[PDB]
């Protein structure tokens, strides 16, 4: 009785969604993609799951406020037109003052015979944190994964509508909070820091809530004015089209 599931979230998406969504994918489906494996990754709570639940359109992942817990990676896969996107939503990586390395390889073998185009690192913009306990994780995923991983990385971060309290200029904000972050990854895992500059990771920035509003059709937008979500795939197929190896060997 079951095959995959029916993209209900899809006929979900408001239109200008819907048409930009169908174009990413349209693009795939040329170079002989009818398929796309998204992975989530990251510190507990700073919204993996939140996000999951954003782009398929469904509420297929469950949030929580406690994610101390979780601890076995569940795949989210749903198809339509013959294109099948799937996204794995990896449980929380810190576990309790430190890095979590039973759960760290507990994804590791999730993923066995699998393939990986787009590997999602979720944190919370909402943050202002030199987080180090950060620069552990930067250095277990390097770990695990690899040269491969950060090429084929993307970051995100969420609580993209974060109004920075009594100072200004969410663009001043934002980018010393992405710089940071990409700075303890150029530096953290330790290979990339002069060939980061290279290729460049990039950022994308979400805002999960319910209250996040819209724009003119109707979609989540954020501050800056644009949709995240429609503009977010747009980042994860252009990553899922670049040919670099994907996580590997
Ligand atoms: N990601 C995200 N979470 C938000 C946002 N606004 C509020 N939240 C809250 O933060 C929590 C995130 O939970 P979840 O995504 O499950 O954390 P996970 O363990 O990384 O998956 C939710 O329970 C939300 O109530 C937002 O813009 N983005
Ligand atoms: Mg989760």
Request: glycine share 8%; net charge neutral.
């Amino acid at each position: 009785g079951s095959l995959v599931r029916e993209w209900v979230g899809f006929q979900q998406f408001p239109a200008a969604t819907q048409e930009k969504l169908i174009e990413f994918f349209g693009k795939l489906k040329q170079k002989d993609m009818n398929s796309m494996t998204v992975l989530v990754l990251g510190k507990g709570g700073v919204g993996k799951s939140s996000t999951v639940n954003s782009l398929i359109g469904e509420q297929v992942v469950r949030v929580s406020p406690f994610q101390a817990e979780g601890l076995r990676p569940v795949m989210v896969s749903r198809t339509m037109g013959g294109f099948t996107i799937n996204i794995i939503d990896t449980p929380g990586l810190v576990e309790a003052g430190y890095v979590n390395h039973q759960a760290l390889e507990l994804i590791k073998g999730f993923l066995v015979n699998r393939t990986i185009d787009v590997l999602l690192y979720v944190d919370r913009l909402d943050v202002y944190a030199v987080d180090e306990l950060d620069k552990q994780v930067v250095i277990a995923i390097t770990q695990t994964f690899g040269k491969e991983i950060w090429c084929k990385t993307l970051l995100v971060l969420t609580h993209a509508q974060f109004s920075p309290p009594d100072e200004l200029s969410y663009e001043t904000f934002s980018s010393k909070r992405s710089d940071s972050l990409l700075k303890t990854i150029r530096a953290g895992s330790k290979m990339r820091k002069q060939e980061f500059e290279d290729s460049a990771i990039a950022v994308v920035y979400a805002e999960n809530s319910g209250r996040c509003s819209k724009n003119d059709k109707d979609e989540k937008a954020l501050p800056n004015g644009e949709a995240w979500i429609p503009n977010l795939v747009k980042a994860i197929t252009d990553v899922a089209t670049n040919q670099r190896k994907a996580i590997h060997v």
